Symmetry: D2
Subunit: 93 residues, 4 copies
């Protein structure tokens, strides 16, 4: 099972255009829109390959893709961000 | 950090299946906060004192709600990731 | 086109107060379509054949759901616009 | 009561930076996020001046503001767009 840092870095291999940061933010919003549709239509559950198009699962995945792509573009390590949040959570507490 | 364990760990303390709209509202809220952080140029890997309101934090918060929504809608993100890579490959592989 | 009449005219054919989440989903859908139209640079005032998928059309569609949500949530956009201009003025006027 | 073209053009008078188109799109998303919060918290109805902050009304208004601001930035006449949509609707039909 893939690590989040591995997903980020695979994405960075084939989809990383630092001169076009805005692209990735536009894409995030597009996928959030597609997600909204898929939830509106109740396309829940875990699809098979054939059921994947337009499913909530696919759209959640596409949002995730752009979260990772934006992290690459903006010099963010998500796993390291989590650790720092843990530090803050522990003082809270 | 792995996708299934992350989803699952969040599910342990934040799972209210009777409140599915809540998770969608929250996603949109974090995406707006993300938008603000990008607009303000709060990029890079923040130190502890820079964390709050950083692009980094807001990306995490969006990720959090992606995982929380996946739990709510019966979705396994890891399985879905695998199917998405299979579909791409079947589309284009010789 | 005036804000109250626009809201009201939409209310005539599209008002389902039992389906308030519907209008919020639709807003987010149109905002995503707007995002695509801006990304693709489909700006300017389109002719009839350019209308579908133009930044112009998607801005209208977002506006539509803003008005539809206002109806749903008991909001008068015109009155609200007036109060917002009053508030700005009370904030800064000498 | 103000026309939509008057709202667009008032906004254009005090908030129009064509070299910063992206700003307006970021702002639209910010206000959509604030809107989401205000609906989540059920802050419906028509506020008075004192109740305006954080209300659904204010947030819907702020989204509208950015719809008009984006229309200015992207050379869009909303009223003219409506007329053209009417033409298309009438063929539909
Ligand atoms: Mg998609
Ligand atoms: Mg946040
Ligand atoms: Mg549309
Ligand atoms: Mg606001």
């Amino acid at each position: 099972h893939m690590k989040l840092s591995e997903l980020q870095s695979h994405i960075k291999e084939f989809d990383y255009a630092p001169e076009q940061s805005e692209h990735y933010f536009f894409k995030l919003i597009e996928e959030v829109g597609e997600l909204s549709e898929s939830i509106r239509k109740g396309k829940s559950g875990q699809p098979t390959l054939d059921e994947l198009k337009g499913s909530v699962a696919e759209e959640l995945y596409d949002v995730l893709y752009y979260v990772c792509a934006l992290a690459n573009i903006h010099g963010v390590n998500l796993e390291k961000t989590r650790e720092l949040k843990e530090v803050l959570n522990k003082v809270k507490y």
